Amino acid sequence: EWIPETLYNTAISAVVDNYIRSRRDIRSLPENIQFDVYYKLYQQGRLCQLGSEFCELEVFAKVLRALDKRHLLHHCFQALMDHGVKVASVLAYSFSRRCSYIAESDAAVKEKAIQVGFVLGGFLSDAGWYSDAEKVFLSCLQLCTLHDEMLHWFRAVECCVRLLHVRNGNCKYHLGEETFKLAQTYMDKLSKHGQQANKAALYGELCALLFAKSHYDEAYKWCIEAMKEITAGLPVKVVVDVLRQASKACVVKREFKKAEQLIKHAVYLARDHFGSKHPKYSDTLLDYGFYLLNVDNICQSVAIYQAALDIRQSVFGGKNIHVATAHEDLAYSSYVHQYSSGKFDNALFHAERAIGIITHILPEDHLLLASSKRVKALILEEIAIDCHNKETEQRLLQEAHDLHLSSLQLAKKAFGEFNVQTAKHYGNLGRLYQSMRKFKEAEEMHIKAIQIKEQLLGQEDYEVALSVGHLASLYNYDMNQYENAEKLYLRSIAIGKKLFGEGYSGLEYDYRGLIKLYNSIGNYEKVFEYHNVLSNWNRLRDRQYSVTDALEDVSTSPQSTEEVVQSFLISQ
């Protein structure tokens, strides 16, 4: 029944127990034994004796090369940062000091301080501590750009493409633009000497930067060059990153046919080369649930975010920015899923968790807090309208008002006034004011959002059409201007039928809006007409919607890497 424990683990439990008398002699052990000892220091709960050994680069750089057991490390590190020890900040400071001490030293020694810099930067970027992986990459870039040889050119290019990711992920897009300009200059200098390096990762990261900035046309163009730059010798992680950014740009560009294949191949490749419980696979699922949510397949989306949050809780502890974004995405997909049913208790918990995390690891004035403050308030308004107590709904509306105004202020501070994300915030706040009996300014908020979306998204986008339907529903039930509501319903229904087939989820809400409007005016023939149309929509939805798990749908894709990129290039 009881298998005897191995000699290795018993000696590990003996070295750890005799830890203080042999603390300095552990660092002379093999890196495998070193990681096993420092993991036993975490299993036993000796977090304070581990936060003084992982807090030094003489030890941490000697344990980051445990590539077989790295997820365990991601659990230890995320414990220490949750414990109280600022391991990320102290590791960044130690690396900055080491780089300053090495800058005048020999160039051969300088490169050994870059490979240690790359592994530590990649780890601290994977763990979600971009703000403390930014200093590591800045020191790496400076140390590489002190001299200008070909190897230093390549190292500077790699550090530039890595530093854009840790800058874009921290919502520092303005510095990301300058970082990309520096990368462009460095690659131009490299190409002027006849040496060309693959820039697919750089272009995909720029696509992420612009998609965050909501420059969808430019993001899609850079996606086109990124997919043109894809080769066969690239590492799989770079390919997955490029495909994931390609998918999440093509979805927002409303090209659901190509983005479907892109994201399915991305998920399949992440599952094969990495595993079912890898952080990169978790990110691929988190951006695959985005695609599934934006192609009217809301329900399956919840089955993907929950399959992407559960990977980032097993790997990234409990207080992380990578589990915070998974929480906020699952808090929003469940919010859309249970919009009709009113089952927002789960979607509220997954939104308070993201708020309680980002408010703890990020400052108040951070854009990532704005997105999570949004979703929590959208669940807050949906609970409030279903709430019966007038004081409860009043205070919930006030809390949602505070959350939307804070999110809008943050979005205006970072993005600007005429951006798509700010327009989405305006539309959400207009819906909130409609729920708050402030209709006169609610119509103004909807009009401002519609104008901002039209200035950028045009008349053929679904994002503007959804707020058009929101404003028309405001007009029908609470403004009585039935002509504007009718024309905006017509535009929204036309766009929805053009894009999302014939069984789009909001089409039912639009049809009920038309039915109530036509009942209000008095014409009772078109009431029966659109009642029949609503029944037609219901039967199409019933005979179209099939409950199929997405993970088994992507279980074995018969399409390889070359075929996907070839098909994407052929389509463009």
Partner: peptide, 7 residues
């Protein structure tokens, strides 16, 4: 309901 979902 009387209004569509989020965006």
């Amino acid at each position: 309901q009387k209004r569509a979902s989020g965006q």
